[PDB]
Amino acid sequence: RTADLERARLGDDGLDFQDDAAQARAFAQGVFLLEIPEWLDLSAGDRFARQFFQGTGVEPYGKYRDLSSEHFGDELLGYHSRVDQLEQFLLERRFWGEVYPSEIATLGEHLTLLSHRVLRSVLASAGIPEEDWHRASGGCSETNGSYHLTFNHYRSAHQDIGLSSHKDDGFITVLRTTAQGLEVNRDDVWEKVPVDPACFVVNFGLSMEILTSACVTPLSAIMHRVSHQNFDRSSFGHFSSSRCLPGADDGIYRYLPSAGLERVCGSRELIEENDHEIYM
Ligand SMILES: C[C@@H](CCO)[C@@H]1NC(=O)/C(=C/[C@@](C)(O)CO)NC1=O
Ligand SMILES: O=C(O)CCC(=O)C(=O)O
Ligand SMILES: [Cl-]
Ligand SMILES: [Cl-]
Ligand SMILES: [Fe+2]
């Protein structure tokens, strides 16, 4: 089974689906395809995902395997071997300019502003007053959220699922994938996400679900996984969360229609609990 996802594009007015019914389905499912801008170069990011795990013998990106949690004072960051086939390199935007290769930081900045534009179209369709967007999004309705540019490599030799079923933590994930393996559970059936290297996959995360859970049309965080890989696979994604710095956490809120925002938990708190459940 392959999912029939709606396709969108970023245009002069924001997210453009084929019509209003198509936007409504896409937002209800919590997953759709987004056309990649023709000027946007993804080849350095593609190369980074193929290389980051390989060590200093492999140029220019293999040396990032050596950067663990500890070099960043944030357990979330650096190279992480997961219990699934997946291994990752995760870096939050405050470190991009200093730590990533300059062309990788550039990529992360393009994706941040693209995701920013995507998120603002979603918030407008949710009927949340604009003056509440910054607090409801922990800064992602502007450019003051926390942003992780995360690179993924699936070790086909590991006898695990590729990546366990899960929801992402945040508001928006912009996923770059060029090979089969991603599956989504929109209703109660698992379905393959069709591969289209001209489109990103756009997902909503748990924060979008929490934020809109009391709205007239709640938006859901899509349950997704990566099936066991028999050959290697790589990908990367840009993740937007309520600002979750150590000691400067914007928090997670739900919107109560006609009332305002009610605090639910911390952003880092939600990330830690989610990561814990994904991998145990
Ligand atoms: C906030 C960071 C996660 C920090 O750990 C961000 N949000 C996610 O939900 C996530 C999911 C996984 C499955 O890739 C983690 O393995 N990736 C990310 O980059
Ligand atoms: O590699 C993929 O296609 C999905 C990765 C993912 O879902 C994640 O890291 O959150
Ligand atoms: Cl830090
Ligand atoms: Cl390894
Ligand atoms: Fe995910």
Describe it for me?
Helices cover 25% and strands 30% of the residues. The protein is of the alpha+beta class and 280 residues long. It has one domain (7-278): Sandwich (Jelly Rolls), CATH 2.60.120. Strand 9 and strand 10 (190-192) form a beta hairpin. It starts with 6 loop residues before the first strand and ends with a helix. 40% of the residues are buried. The site of one chloride ion has 3 residues, from loops. The PDB classes it as oxidoreductase. Keywords: complex, bicyclomycin, dioxygenase, oxidoreductase. It forms a monomeric assembly.
What percentage of amino acids are in beta strands?
Answer: 25-35%
Strand order of the largest sheet: 2-1-3-11-8-13-6-5-4
CATH classification class: Mainly Beta
Kindly name the structural category: alpha+beta
Query: Main beta sheet, described?
Result: 9 strands, mixed
Q: CATH topology, which one?
A: Jelly Rolls
Share of residues in helices = 25-40%
CATH superfamily: B-lactam Antibiotic, Isopenicillin N Synthase, Chain
| C-alpha end-to-end distance | 28 Å
Count the domains: 1
What molecules are bound to this protein? ligand 5P0, 2-oxoglutaric acid, chloride ion, fe (ii) ion
PDB class: oxidoreductase
Keywords: complex, bicyclomycin, dioxygenase, oxidoreductase
Assembly: monomeric
Entry title: The complex structure of soBcmB and its intermediate product 2a
